[PDB]
């Protein structure tokens, strides 16, 4: 829960999310762009025409919203189990050989 830490009056516009995109995302893919998304038969992504909508939208995190709209801080940890010299482990104490 981070409702009382990531909200601004009148809706918070400091946290944005991409509402429109032309293609599907691959795993662990990061993309930053502002080209106008194309939805109709009129060219977009470089020219502003018909059915060309801005690909970005704002959450508008208000100071008091429902639990489904309050800002929550999310961290995802991805673990790599590939064969390599292990560099991170638990506090499991070592023992004599």
């Amino acid at each position: 829960n981070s409702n009382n830490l990531d909200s601004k009056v009148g809706g918070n516009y400091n946290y944005l999310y991409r509402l429109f995109r032309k293609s599907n995302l691959k795993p662990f893919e990061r993309d930053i762009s502002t080209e106008i998304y194309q939805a109709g038969s009129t060219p977009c992504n470089g020219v502003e025409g018909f059915n060309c909508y801005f690909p970005l939208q704002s959450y508008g995190f208000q100071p008091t919203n429902g639990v489904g709209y309050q800002p929550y801080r999310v961290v995802v940890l991805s673990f790599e189990l590939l064969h390599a010299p292990a560099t991170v482990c638990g506090p499991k104490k070592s023992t004599n050989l």
Partner: antibody
Amino acid sequence: EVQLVESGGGLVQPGGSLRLSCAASGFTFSGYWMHWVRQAPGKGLVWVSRVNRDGSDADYADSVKGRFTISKDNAKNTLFLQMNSLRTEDTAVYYCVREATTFGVIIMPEWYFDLWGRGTLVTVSS
Amino acid sequence: EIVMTQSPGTLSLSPGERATLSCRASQSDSSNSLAWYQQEPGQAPRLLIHDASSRATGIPDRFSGSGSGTDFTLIISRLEPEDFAVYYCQLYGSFGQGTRLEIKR
């Protein structure tokens, strides 16, 4: 003990500028989020602003939006509140108040004040 | 944005009479995030309780109030000649107008 000393303030013409400082002693100033509030003479208390532990994010009130800036250094252990283009309706005594934090795995301030400093009177008039 | 209205405006009590102060918050999404304060006319406010249920350090045991929903009420167990002050309630982003407690005569 733990006390907050207000410095600055006094007479100032409307439309001028002023700086208020809150010296902190007796507690770890870095870890506690800060608030600044005010009380008009003979009126109830009114919240003004809040500042983070690092002093980078703020939520200045609507009545003080644009003409107030808050700053929170950690090395020299004091709080700045700077005001510009003052108006006649903010003539009051300003307090700086701490915000309690659980200080656990998440700081998570509970948004409630613990100690009230000896505030300072700011008056604006021609 | 919140206007946290304290009711009623002024109560008079005999110096040994308990009472309760009822304050309604406009937006009842606080989840018992509330505080009460007692400020003498010539000095600063002090904290009385926190989280609307638990009490602070050095508080008298008489000050014990609980509330839920929009209606938040604080109850005092008894009275002493010190209640002649202003009780200010506190939601997270607002302050109450204040209630005057007077000794009856």
